[PDB]
Structure 1
Amino acid sequence: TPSHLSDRYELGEILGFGGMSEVHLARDLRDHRDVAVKVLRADLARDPSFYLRFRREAQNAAALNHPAIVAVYDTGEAETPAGPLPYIVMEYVDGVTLRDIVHTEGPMTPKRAIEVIADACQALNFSHQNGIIHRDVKPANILISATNAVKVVDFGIARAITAQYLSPEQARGDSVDARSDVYSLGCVLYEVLTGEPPFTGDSPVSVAYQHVREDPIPPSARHEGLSADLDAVVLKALAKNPENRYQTAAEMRADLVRVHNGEPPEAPKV
């Protein structure tokens, strides 16, 4: 990868690695600001199967406009003498992932967890009202900024009509919809609350199997300082049948809000 893309974006340190792409902190020398640039790993920039796969993801990136969603600024294709190198330029978030927080700091307090997840529900809801399912909600895809704001990254591109955060339907290979993001957000909620996701296993298959077939253990049975109410919410978000989950991320956030307040939630009492 070159030091500069398009004589505009000056690549700096790696923020994170993804499937085929890596995200860099960079200076937009033209707009004079720091940005995040997602590029295709240089080695992979010759396999056409990858160049094409990435360019569609870039061309068709979810460009949503919401405080809790990392914006998309620009998309491009640079010119290293070796070859054309495709990239997406995005909002930069000076912060750390939920995955890092949970790992270095452990489970959050119920109050903090609720604030974080309800804020994620807003990003998800705004995304949903705009026709877009994230499909990969998970702690590594939720960012917390230095000033403590939630920023969600890595929305999947629109479609036609590991495994710790899959919904039963993705696991079965059935069709997914907004409710599917709901289930996954609940997995994250479960983890920030208890230090662990609902299901663990020796292999993605095992975990997938559990999502589809095993009853989750109520969070309070795995960590202290969790109320029965809060249990009911998490458990509803984790319902096996989409028909029985929260129907929208809004519904989910409203029940989270009630628990923050200390009011009984609309969720069932197990």
Structure 2
Amino acid sequence: MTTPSHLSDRYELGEILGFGGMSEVHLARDLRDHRDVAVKVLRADLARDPSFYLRFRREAQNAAALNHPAIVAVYDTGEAETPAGPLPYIVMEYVDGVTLRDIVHTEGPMTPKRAIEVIADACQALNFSHQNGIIHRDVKPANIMISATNAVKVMDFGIARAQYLSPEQARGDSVDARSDVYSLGCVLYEVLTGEPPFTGDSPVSVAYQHVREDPIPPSARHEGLSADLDAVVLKALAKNPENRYQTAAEMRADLVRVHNGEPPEAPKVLT
């Protein structure tokens, strides 16, 4: 079962780049604009499943389109008619790079300074989104890439539908910029320690832990991590949104302090 060689007459597919729970991403040439793009398409094997067809249209295809250097731009969406059936797709900015999920998997924890740099840049992407009224809602290692020229790129903003969810998302409360802060804190935790804050035999077990259980401070999970870093990470991961960083920009400012070896403003954490 293949994905067609073309999507409309416009997009000529090249190499496969990646795949996920519901889609496959291909490098493509836009023949109209002479541009290499990434085309995300419903996976060829799941393509006959109505439940996935629906998810793809309602979720993947609804990624918000934002113009920022740290955000993967969304160019186009559509549906190709395939001998098998209608095949939905979304066209976006091509990133020659690797997701943070892959980096952690293949290389282990990032050095602390590199981790701070990467997450500080993610904060800029989130600030821009928030300033433009969009909550990301699904910040996770899989939604952040680093390019071959070391630029951070954040993707797949503003979609509806456990390792990275905020307590409020677990509870069905209001989700806001502070929920994105929390979830980015989880990512930061994971790139520093090599492990996410909470692991469980199920998503309900992980959700429970987000609501109810204190994360182990990063310096307890892994060597070379300071108490200043514990302080920043543990603030982003506060259960009560009022005790977290209130904005992505407030979080970034403490990251930049720690990068420059200045004390963060986050409450001290002792171990």
TM-score by length of 1: 0.92
> Aligned to 2:150, what secondary structure does the other structure show?
coil
- Give the 3 Å change call, closer, same or farther, for CA 169–214 of structure 1 in structure 2: same
**Cα distance, 1:197 vs. partner?**
1.0
Cα contact 1:45–1:85 (8 A) shared by 2: yes
Q: 1:77-116 deviations in whole A, cap 9, x for unaligned?
A: 2222433222111000001111111111111111110000
Q: 1:199-238 deviations in whole A, cap 9, x for unaligned?
A: 1222222221111111111111111211111110000000
Range 92-101 or range 82-91, more displaced = 82-91
Cα contact 1:134–1:155 (8 A) shared by 2: yes
Cα contact 1:107–1:191 (8 A) shared by 2: yes
**Cα distance, 1:149 vs. partner?**
0.5
**Cα distance, 1:47 vs. partner?**
5.1
Aligned residues: percent identity?
A: 99
Range 53-62 or range 106-115, more displaced = 53-62
Cα contact 2:137–2:159 (8 A) shared by 1: no
**Cα distance, 1:56 vs. partner?**
4.6
Cα contact 2:60–2:90 (8 A) shared by 1: yes
* Unaligned runs of at least 5 residues, structure 1: none
> Aligned to 2:45, what secondary structure does the other structure show?
helix
Map residues 37-186 of structure 1 onto 2, 5 A cutoff: 37-42=39-44, 44-45=46-47, 50-57=52-59, 60-157=62-159, 163-186=162-185
Q: 1:166-197 deviations in whole A, cap 9, x for unaligned?
A: 11111122221111010010011011111111
TM-score by length of 2: 0.92
Range 59-68 or range 234-243, more displaced = 59-68
- Give the 3 Å change call, closer, same or farther, for CA 194–28 of structure 1 in structure 2: same
> Aligned to 2:191, what secondary structure does the other structure show?
helix
- Give the 3 Å change call, closer, same or farther, for CA 168–25 of structure 1 in structure 2: same
- Give the 3 Å change call, closer, same or farther, for CA 58–233 of structure 1 in structure 2: closer
**Cα distance, 1:59 vs. partner?**
6.4
**Cα distance, 1:39 vs. partner?**
1.3
> Aligned to 1:35, what secondary structure does the other structure show?
strand
**Cα distance, 1:48 vs. partner?**
5.2
- Write the distance in 2 (CA, Å) between the matches of 1:131 and 1:143: 23
- Give the 3 Å change call, closer, same or farther, for CA 229–100 of structure 1 in structure 2: same
Cα contact 2:25–2:41 (8 A) shared by 1: yes
- Give the 3 Å change call, closer, same or farther, for CA 199–48 of structure 1 in structure 2: closer
Aligned-residue CA RMSD (Å): 1.9
- Give the 3 Å change call, closer, same or farther, for CA 173–223 of structure 1 in structure 2: same
- Write the distance in 2 (CA, Å) between the matches of 1:176 and 1:4: 39
**Cα distance, 1:157 vs. partner?**
3.5
Cα contact 1:58–1:75 (8 A) shared by 2: no
> Aligned to 1:183, what secondary structure does the other structure show?
helix
Aligned to 1:234: 233
Range 44-53 or range 133-142, more displaced = 44-53
Cα contact 1:132–1:158 (8 A) shared by 2: no
- Give the 3 Å change call, closer, same or farther, for CA 107–181 of structure 1 in structure 2: same
